[PDB]
Design a binder for this molecule. Structure first.
Ligand SMILES: *C/C=C(C)/C=C/C=C(C)/C=C/C1=C(C)CCCC1(C)C
Ligand SMILES: CCCCCCCCO[C@@H]1O[C@H](CO)[C@@H](O)[C@H](O)[C@H]1O
Length: 217
């Protein structure tokens, strides 16, 4: 499909501009803030690589009567934790709390990946595992991580809240897409499925980064 490839290109391109943009803004940054710029460049860069790889025809593996794009999940497993890290730096979390939110994040990504890789109905069981871990992650986001961020300057306090809403609201859509897309009910075509994910991936990553750069000043 030529349509799947262009959607992948659009993604790689959109991520590229995000990266270059963040790497530029990150250029010349204090020895106590570069961490943000550099993590933002990783979130964007990794995704860009993953998209170009898929655009090029790599990772399109068949499972049952569908095809699963492995580079998407590899990306997710590597990038979502960085997003949570970033959010964590804002909130002012320590190793303890960081550690908790990160693993909870990894379980849902690992479970989603495993789930999409199995042909049998037990895939729903794997999906269900990620579902419960995600509600947990969201709990920590709007809960303890929030109260924890309420101790920063009015500036940081407001940036975190905008980013967590953006995050929580958009991420909650992914599972439903998975459920309706080919991995589950396949009530959604691969192409629409991919178009939707590309958009979400872009906003929750590059959209995320730009909102942060705006705040930087
Ligand atoms: C840059 C990529 C991002 C922000 C990807 C986010 C993906 C999710 C929030 C996926 C969530 C899922 C569940 C909550 C249930 C298990 C199945 C998944 C992996 C689709
Ligand atoms: C890309 C967004 C970076 C935001 C960095 C906020 C750093 C706040 O740093 C703050 C004071 O000094 C320090 O507590």
């Amino acid at each position: 499909m030529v349509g799947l490839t262009t959607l992948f290109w659009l993604g790689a391109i959109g991520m590229l501009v995000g990266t270059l943009a963040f790497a530029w803004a990150g250029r010349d940054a204090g020895s106590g803030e570069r961490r943000y710029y550099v993590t933002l460049v990783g979130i964007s860069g990794i995704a860009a690589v993953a998209y170009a790889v898929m655009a090029l025809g790599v990772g399109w593996v068949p499972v049952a009567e569908r095809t699963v794009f492995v580079p998407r999940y590899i990306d997710w497993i590597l990038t979502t934790p960085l997003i949570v890290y970033f959010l964590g730096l804002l909130a002012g979390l320590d190793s303890r709390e960081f550690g908790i939110v990160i693993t909870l994040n990894t379980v849902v990504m690992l479970a989603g990946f495993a789930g999409a890789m199995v042909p049998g109905i037990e895939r729903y069981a794997l999906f269900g595992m990620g579902a419960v871990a995600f509600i947990g992650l969201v709990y920590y986001l709007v809960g303890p991580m929030t109260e924890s961020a309420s101790q920063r300057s009015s500036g940081i306090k407001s940036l975190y809240v905008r980013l967590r809403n953006l995050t929580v609201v958009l991420w909650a859509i992914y599972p439903f897409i998975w459920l309706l897309g080919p991995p589950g009910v396949a009530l959604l075509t691969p192409t629409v499925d991919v178009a939707l994910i590309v958009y979400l991936d872009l906003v929750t990553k590059v959209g995320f980064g730009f909102i942060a750069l705006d705040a930087a000043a």
